[PDB]
Amino acid sequence: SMNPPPPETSNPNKPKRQTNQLQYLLRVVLKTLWKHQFAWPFQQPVDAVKLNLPDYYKIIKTPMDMGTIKKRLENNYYWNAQECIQDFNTMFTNCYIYNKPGDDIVLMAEALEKLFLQKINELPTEET
Numbered sequence: 001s002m003n004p005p006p007p008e009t010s011n012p013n014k015p016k017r018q019t020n021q022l023q024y025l026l027r028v029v030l031k032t033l034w035k036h037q038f039a040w041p042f043q044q045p046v047d048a049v050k051l052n053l054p055d056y057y058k059i060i061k062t063p064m065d066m067g068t069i070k071k072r073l074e075n076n077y078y079w080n081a082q083e084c085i086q087d088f089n090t091m092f093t094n095c096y097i098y099n100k101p102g103d104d105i106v107l108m109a110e111a112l113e114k115l116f117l118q119k120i121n122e123l124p125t126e127e128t
C-alpha cells in the first residue's frame, strides 16, 4: 500500500488572507503543539509504508497533520481561522477513528488536543 499525494499546501487559485487570528494560529497554537514532547507522530503526513499501515488510507479519507498545517500557515494558504482550526480537528479525529482507546498515539493526540482547546478558547478578536 502506497502513500497518497499529500494534502494541498499551495494553490494560487485559492484566495488568501493574512489576519491576526491566522497569525495567532501560527505563533501561539501551532508553535505550542509543535514543541511538545508528543508532537513527533503528527509533524508530517502518516507514512503508511514506513509504519507498516497498509490499511491507513483505506480508513482515513481526509488525512491531515501538523507538517501540512505548518506549511499552510507559513505559506498563507487560508482565508480564515476556522479553516485552520478544522485542519487540527481533522487530524485529532483521524487519530481517534483509526486507533483504539488508550493506545499511546491516542494519549499523545489527547494531550495535544488539551493544549489546542485551551489556546483556541483565547483566539483573539478579529482586527477591523
Ligand SMILES: COc1ccc(/C=C(/C(=O)N2CC(=O)Nc3ccccc32)c2ccccc2)cc1
Pocket: 040, 041, 042, 046, 051, 053, 094, 095, 098, 099, 104, 105
Ligand atoms: C510511542 O508510541 C507511538 C508513537 C507513534 C505512533 C504512531 C505513528 C502514526 O502516525 N500512526 C498513524 C496512526 O494513527 N496510528 C498508528 C498505529 C501504528 C503505527 C503508526 C501509527 C508514527 C508516526 C511517526 C513515526 C512512527 C509512528 C504510535 C505509537
